[PDB]
C-alpha cells in the first residue's frame, strides 16, 4: 500500500459531493488537543 503519513503541515477541506461545495477549509501547522 501507499504511505500517507501526516507527520508535517497539511491543508484540508470538508466538502459535499452532490453540490460540490466546500463547507470548511484550513491549514494545520501545529497539532493541538
Amino acid at each position: 500500500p501507499i504511505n500517507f503519513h501526516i507527520n508535517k503541515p497539511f491543508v484540508f477541506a470538508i466538502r459535499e459531493k452532490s453540490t460540490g461545495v466546500i463547507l470548511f477549509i484550513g491549514e494545520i501547522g501545529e497539532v493541538k488537543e
Binding site: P1, N7, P9, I25, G26
Partner: protein, 334 residues
C-alpha cells in the same frame, strides 16, 4: 448552468480566495475557515444593500452579475440539499437576525431572509443584560456548544446582527481504532517537532498526486461528505498549496482521485480560530464601501447604517470516530 454548476465554481473560487487572503493577513500556525458560513451571513446582509455597497459585496463574494433573486434561490437550494443528503451525518445551517427593538426594519428584507435562509428574526433591547447571553446562547445551541460566544461586547449604538452558524458532525466510513493510536513525532510549520497522538489504519481511500503533493479523500456517513487532505511532498510547503489553489487545481484533484490501498497515519487534532474579516481580508477581496459611513442599506432601514465588524469563529476536532466542525459568522451593523 449559471445558477447551478457555474455558481458552485464561483463559490469554491470564493473559498480559495478567502483562504489565501486570510493566510496572507494572519500569523498563526493554523487557519480554519467556513467560506459557506461567511458567504451565507454576507448574502443575508446583501439583500439590504444598494449601488456600489451591493456591487463591492458581490465582488468580494464572487457573485457579480447575479441578481438577488438568483443568489437567494441558490442559497436556499444549497442549504436544503446539504441538510438532507445524508441522514447519518449531523448537519446544521442556522441563520438569525437580531435588531434594535423600536427601530423600523423593512419587511421585504426580513421576509426574504426568513424565506431563503430560514432566518430567525428577533427585535431585542441591546442594553438588556439578557441580550448578549441570548445571542451567544443561540450560537452555542447551533454548534453543539462548540462555539459558545460570538460576541464579548455589544457597542452602545448597535443596530443589527446577522448571524450564520454551520455545524458538522460526521463519522468516518472507515474509523480508526483508538487502540492503534500511538505517540509519534509531528514536524510543525515553525520547524520544531512535537509529540502527538498519531492515529493509524490501513484501508481503501481515494488517492491522487501531482507535482507538489499527495491527496487523500476520507468519506463520512453515506459518502456524500468527505475530507480532502493535501499533504505536500518533502521540501514542499502548505503555503505553496494554498497560493496555487483555484477551481482548476481543485477540479484536477477531485477528478484524479482513485480507490487505493493506503497506510494512513493522521494526528488527532483540534483547532479554534477567530477572525475580524472587516479589518483587511474582506477589503483586499474588494469589499470597502460597506464598512464606511458611505454604505447604503435602504433595503434594511431609512437610517444610514454600515457594517462595523464581520466576526468569524471556527472549531474543528478530528479523532478516531470522525470529525466535528462548526463555524459562526456575525455581521454587525451600526
Amino acid at each position: 448552468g449559471p445558477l447551478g454548476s457555474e455558481k458552485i465554481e464561483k463559490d469554491n473560487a470564493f473559498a480559495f480566495d478567502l483562504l489565501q487572503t486570510t493566510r496572507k493577513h494572519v500569523t498563526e500556525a493554523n487557519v480554519f475557515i467556513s467560506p459557506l458560513s461567511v458567504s451565507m451571513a454576507l448574502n443575508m446582509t446583501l439583500n439590504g444593500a444598494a449601488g456600489v455597497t451591493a456591487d463591492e459585496m458581490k465582488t468580494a463574494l464572487r457573485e457579480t452579475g447575479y441578481t438577488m433573486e438568483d443568489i437567494n434561490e441558490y442559497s436556499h437550494s444549497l442549504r436544503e440539499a446539504l441538510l438532507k443528503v445524508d441522514p447519518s451525518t449531523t448537519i446544521g445551517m442556522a441563520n438569525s437576525i437580531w435588531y434594535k427593538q423600536g427601530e423600523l426594519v423593512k419587511e421585504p428584507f426580513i421576509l426574504a431572509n426568513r424565506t431563503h435562509y430560514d432566518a430567525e428574526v428577533k427585535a431585542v433591547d441591546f442594553s438588556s443584560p439578557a441580550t448578549l447571553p441570548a445571542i451567544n446562547g443561540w450560537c452555542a445551541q447551533k454548534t453543539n456548544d462548540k462555539i459558545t460566544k460570538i460576541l464579548d461586547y455589544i457597542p452602545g449604538n448597535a443596530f443589527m446582527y446577522l448571524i450564520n452558524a454551520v455545524y458538522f458532525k460526521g463519522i468516518w466510513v472507515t474509523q480508526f481504532k483508538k487502540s492503534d493510536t500511538k505517540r509519534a513525532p509531528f514536524r510543525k510549520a515553525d520547524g520544531t517537532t512535537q509529540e502527538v497522538n498519531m492515529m493509524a489504519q490501513k484501508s481503501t481511500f481515494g488517492y491522487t498526486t501531482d507535482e507538489c503533493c499527495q491527496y487523500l479523500e476520507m468519506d463520512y456517513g453515506n459518502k456524500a461528505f468527505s475530507m480532502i487532505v493535501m499533504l505536500p511532498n518533502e521540501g514542499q510547503t502548505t503555503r505553496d498549496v494554498i497560493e496555487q489553489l483555484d477551481n482548476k487545481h481543485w477540479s484536477m484533484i477531485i477528478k484524479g482521485i482513485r480507490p487505493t490501498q493506503v497506510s494512513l497515519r493522521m494526528p488527532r487534532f483540534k483547532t479554534e480560530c477567530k477572525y475580524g474579516l472587516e479589518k483587511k481580508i474582506l477589503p483586499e477581496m474588494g469589499m470597502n464601501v460597506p464598512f464606511t459611513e458611505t454604505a447604503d442599506f435602504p433595503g434594511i432601514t431609512d437610517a444610514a447604517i454600515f457594517i462595523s465588524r464581520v466576526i468569524h469563529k471556527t472549531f474543528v476536532q478530528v479523532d478516531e470516530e470522525g470529525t466535528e466542525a462548526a463555524a459562526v459568522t456575525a455581521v454587525e451593523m451600526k
